[PDB]
Paper text:
Glutamine synthetases (GS) catalyze the ATP-dependent ammonium assimilation, the initial step of nitrogen acquisition that must be under tight control to fit cellular needs. The dodecamer is organized as two stacked hexameric rings, and each polypeptide is organized into two parts, a shorter N-terminal domain (β-Grasp fold) and the remaining C-terminal domain. The active sites are located at the interface of the N- and C- terminal domains of the adjacent subunit in the hexameric ring. Two loops in the active center are critical for catalysis: the Glu-flap, involved in shielding the active site during catalysis and deprotonating the intermediate product, and the Asp-50’ loop, which binds and deprotonates ammonium.
GS from Methanothermococcus thermolithotrophicus is inactive in its resting state and switched on by 2-oxoglutarate, a sensor of cellular nitrogen deficiency. The structure of MtGS in its resting state was solved by using the diffraction data obtained by Engilberge et al.. The data was collected on a crystal obtained by co-crystallization with a crystallophore (TbXo4) that corrected the twinning issue inherent to this crystalline form. The MtGS structure presents the typical homo-dodecameric architecture as seen in other structural homologs, with a monomeric unit divided into N-ter (1-111) and C-ter (112-448) domains. Moreover, terbium atoms are located in the active site, coordinated by the residues involved in the Mg2+/Mn2+ recognition. In the apo structure, water molecules replace 2OG in a pocket with a similar volume and slightly open to the solvent. In the resting state, the ATP would clash with the Phe206 and would not bind without displacing the β-sheet 10 (residues 199-205) and the following loop (206-209). In the resting state, the loop 318-325 is constrained by a network of hydrogen bonds and salt bridges from the Asp50ʹ-loop, the side chain of the Arg321 itself being sequestered by Glu70ʹ. In the resting state of MtGS without 2OG or the glutamine feedback-inhibited BsGS, the Glu-flap and the catalytic arginine are locked in an unproductive conformation by the Asp50ʹ-loop.
Numbering used by the authors:
A (entry chain A), B (entry chain B), C (entry chain A): 2 to 38, 39A, 40 to 448
The structure:
């Protein structure tokens, strides 16, 4: 959308209120709103903000600590302008996703959106490279427990691909897809997942920045649609013990000079050296990547040993027990699926680190290990050690320490985000590790 | 419908969401849904999926364990395309029943729908044979027990063919019939059944595959209509002790070269040798057939001795105490009624095994025993032994063991479904056998 | 008490029931009881059991797995014979603490009591050494929350050394002291502790085996006295966040050839080389010792940074921020206080490992570091590193891994207890680490 197209939309729909939206380091969306003043002057005052941005106090935004927090700037990305996706019939209100800039007019180093844009621009400028991601976020719908109102339980008792009445959210999944599709946030399959009250909405395999914006919009929209139905939607990775957690498998590829670089008709499995170097890079840096793609203490309750748990650092052409699975599609569709991520991650940061790790593999021409097709949960600890299969960190603190020692990720995220993320997350881990949990009370009050 | 007819429907109705439906081994319907993209590009993408199919992960579908579960395919049967039968006024959504295929473009051996199609196609190719089934599924409508909200009781106190007000579901039966008829899922008689809250909807005597699709559609639709009325519909075979269970008598016949092969104007009872060989085949294999037509532990609480219980392996022209009853209709309508099946069966598998057993009788020219008109329950054990009247298995495990030793059924179902069904059902039996039931607590807590 | 003294007590008090008590690897007391038969024959049958022991099935005792579990033996220690300490007016019942033996008549390697006896006997035989321990166990008294009956809260709102009515347990502390003192389980100071509902009962500085028996008796007795008052006593180390946890400081010393070996009138601080070598041994092995002295996941919620937390591996003559504090008493009373232990430990195992670590220091003539008087919580991370001050493990798993790599402790505990303890505790850690905690639900359900 061009400035002129936005101004004409504003005039035709009599837009009276505009939201400027951005994201904090933890991936929480944020927005400040302003009235649209009447008259060509108001249209001129809006053009000025749309082209040059608006000032805001970022001192209370998580991860935005720095000099001049009280006069930071929001620079609108007009490609994202639209009616609110979660209130699409209220044409008098609109929003635009923005990048964060400093008072000086330069991208703010602590901006997660600007971070992904930076690494993608560098890849485009240096290698004429494009980066595509197709994520598969899962989530649970919850209702208040009838026996205890203070607690939430899964909204239904349905299962994988189930139909109503066991599946109690076919209209909700349909409605979120309509809300996103209607405004260009392209999505693919939707269905009830394995666990009671669990669901999935797949996203189009697309430009990583568009994908990240689609994911942040989807998270707000599904939560508002759930509330209209008296339910709560959660992206907590493992809300209930004894049932599946929620993951966000990320299909991804890189194209160099307009060609699907991962494809080589004549190579083993039809996977190019570039695809293998990229896979090698993801595997090499996997222990550090998960600090960002699985950034909660609860993320590690899903990343626990099991038949399909994506905790084993290996790749496969069919094995779901590996952290990377390569779909059978070839040609333009050749891509790799990172299965470790969960939907609690900040998509802008998760996509940045996967690209940086894969590109480090390409840059250093890293050799990939042999694929592992044998189910890895079922093999012994000795068989794993013999095959050199390492696991991802067992908890958030272990992942943070791996990230702290990873210079490739530090360069990708930049010092501000890397240090702010480590500081906030070490404090989060400290809060959890000093707490007295219900597990402990149940296990030890009798001693 | 043809590919063009489906595309015209999508364009006219501006269909924005499409469900691809299939069935698992236990007969539970499954579906994944996708948005219909805008304009010509979207019509072309939809044409491709309609003609060539779409990939899905079958790893979480019961009975679908094979190489590359993550990339299996759904191939739409356009003869089944329509608005959702249970949401007929929402024209922006549609569904299509699909066959399950492998990544190689071949029917998946574990697909129950493809299974019935395979046996029917083989019969058509080798003998120019057609197979027709007219099932009579019964079901209960339930309401919460006002004394105990956690329990369900029959929805009314009405009886066989009763009128309102004792019959509290005349509008529900009328509405399910209209929902199915309106979309070509042909149905016939509907009425309140013998037990409180029990009902029946009879299906057109038709091509067995169309019949199975109609039954699978009816089960979802009646459950959604019941919920709209604050009730629950159940196909549990024997939900309440002391009252009738729910059966699914299956009328069936085979026609060879366009002729009603079961009819012979000059033979005894006007029943042809082909009819008698088919009847002999069903009777010979009955103990194994019930493992599929009666696949639940609870199915054997309906298959218990009684005046009208279809547990006696015999046939008759009027006796309701026999497992096979031959209706009086002759000519084109000549057919046999297998009375053992209950609505918990997977119709695709039940129809497959009845045809295979009957065709084994035709192939081997098996002699049928004499019909038994005398009430079998009323006669002594010695009279039954003298007449050679055996009984169907007494419980699910006994039926599974009979199926395991039946090569005719193994060939009909194919190794994948045969072994998967036996494994799943033996685990279901174990769960029941090791449980501590309410009956045991009531009988033994005092000892 | 001699066999004859026990038999005469049995005859005079008409004892009709006798309990044989022992302890499992986790420090949980266990007992089997038998009737005393009438007549000299019954007195003779009792003499036989008192001298030669009785058989029992130890297959269901935690840490007793091995060959012939169903015919293990309990060998009574007549020095421990008495009326039940928690039912002292019921003279017709008595108990005796027993050591665990194998069917062959040799001490069972998995017995915690026999373990402490073994290390103490070896020390006596080789060096004419005696080992004394004076523990200070703290505990909380709990009442049901009025708002939520399913939860427990501190029994009162009193504080350190408080008097009634703020202190609501002066009669309970008095009554436990009377119960123990009356039967020779010597105790010293008793008082309300810092936290609401928290209390302390100090034990006489005595022979380590007598002390361990006194501690196990005290734990059962305070729990029964609490129940008589409608309360619950717990030794959980950190039952409530935001208030002090419960510790069990252990004063200890060794005497060689009847002399207080830790005392040297002419040495710095009047502490002998033997005392310094012992202190050096405790400090060297501290990371592994805490796996046994702090054997619960919750133990590490008390072992967290704080002004007085005993987490810093250092010793001091006055600093409470160090893991070892040396009381000012000299001469016969010269001793060292290990502050890390909590009352969840198995006293027999805790006393065994502290002695073995200290004796390893004496054996190798280990040099002790300089004492640290400066408050260690208040100093920087750099000041600590410069002074070489290490901390104890941050969680149970970290402590288990330290214990697994400690051969001194493995020799002290013996292979059976060392491996059984590691196995049980790694499974306990696994249960905690895969659980979904209330902390996680509170922190992430909103994401
Ligand atoms: Tb730029
Ligand atoms: Tb359920
Ligand atoms: Tb999924
Ligand atoms: Tb494309
Ligand atoms: Tb490594
Ligand atoms: Tb800071
Ligand atoms: Tb064919
Ligand atoms: Tb009635
Ligand atoms: Tb009927
Ligand atoms: Tb017809
Ligand atoms: Tb004819
Ligand atoms: Tb037989
Ligand atoms: Tb299997
Ligand atoms: Tb000895
Ligand atoms: Tb208070
Ligand atoms: Tb104290
Ligand atoms: Tb003394
Ligand atoms: Tb060290
Ligand atoms: Tb073991």
């Amino acid at each position: 959308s061009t400035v002129e197209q936005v101004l004409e939309y504003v005039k035709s729909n009599n837009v009276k209120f505009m939201r400027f939206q951005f994201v904090d380091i933890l991936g929480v969306p944020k927005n400040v709103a302003f009235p649209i003043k009447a008259g060509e002057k108001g249209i001129e005052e809006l053009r000025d903000v749309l082209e040059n941005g608006l000032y805001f106090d970022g001192s209370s935004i998580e991860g935005f600590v720095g000099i001049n927090e009280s006069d930071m700037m929001l620079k609108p990305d007009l490609s994202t302008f639209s009616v609110l996706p979660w209130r699409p019939s209220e044409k008098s209100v609109a929003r635009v996703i923005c990048d964060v800039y400093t008072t000086k007019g330069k991208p703010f180093e602590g901006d997660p959106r600007g971070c992904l844009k930076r690494v993608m621009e560098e890849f485009k400028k240096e290698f004429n490279g494009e980066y595509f991601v197709g994520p598969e976020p899962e989530f649970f719908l919850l209702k208040k427990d009838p026996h205890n109102p203070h607690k939430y339980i899964p909204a239904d008792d349905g299962g994988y691909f189930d139909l109503e009445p066991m599946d109690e959210a076919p209209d909700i999944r349909r409605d979120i897809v309509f809300a996103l599709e209607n405004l260009g946030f392209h999505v693919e399959a939707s269905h009830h997942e394995v666990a009671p009250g669990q669901h999935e909405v797949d996203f189009k395999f697309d430009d990583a920045l568009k994908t990240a914006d689609s994911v942040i919009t989807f998270k707000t929209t599904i939560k508002t649609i759930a509330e209209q139905h008296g339910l709560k939607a959660t992206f907590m990775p493992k809300p209930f013990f004894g049932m599946n957690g929620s993951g966000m498998h990320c299909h991804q590829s890189i194209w160099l000079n307009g060609e699907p670089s991962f494809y080589d008709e004549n190579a083993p499995y039809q996977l190019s050296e570039t695809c293998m170097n990229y896979v090698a890079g993801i595997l090499k840096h996997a222990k550090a990547i998960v600090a960002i793609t699985n950034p909660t203490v609860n993320s590690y309750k899903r990343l626990v040993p099991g038949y399909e748990a994506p905790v084993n650092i290996a790749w496969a052409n069919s094995n779901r027990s590996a952290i990377i699975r390569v779909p059978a599609a070839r040609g333009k569709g050749t891509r790799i699926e990172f299965r470790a991520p969960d939907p609690s991650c900040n998509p802008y940061l998760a996509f940045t680190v996967m690209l940086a790790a894969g590109l480090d593999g390409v840059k250093n021409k890293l050799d990939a290990p042999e694929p592992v097709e044998r189910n890895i949960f079922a093999m012994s600890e000795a068989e794993k050690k013999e095959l050199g299969i390492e696991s991802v960190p067992a908890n958030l603190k272990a992942a943070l320490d791996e990230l702290e020692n990873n210079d490739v990720l530090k360069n990708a995220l930049g010092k501000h985000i890397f240090e702010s993320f480590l500081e906030i997350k070490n404090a989060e881990w400290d809060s959890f590790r000093t707490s007295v949990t219900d597990w402990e009370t149940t296990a030890y009050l009798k001693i």
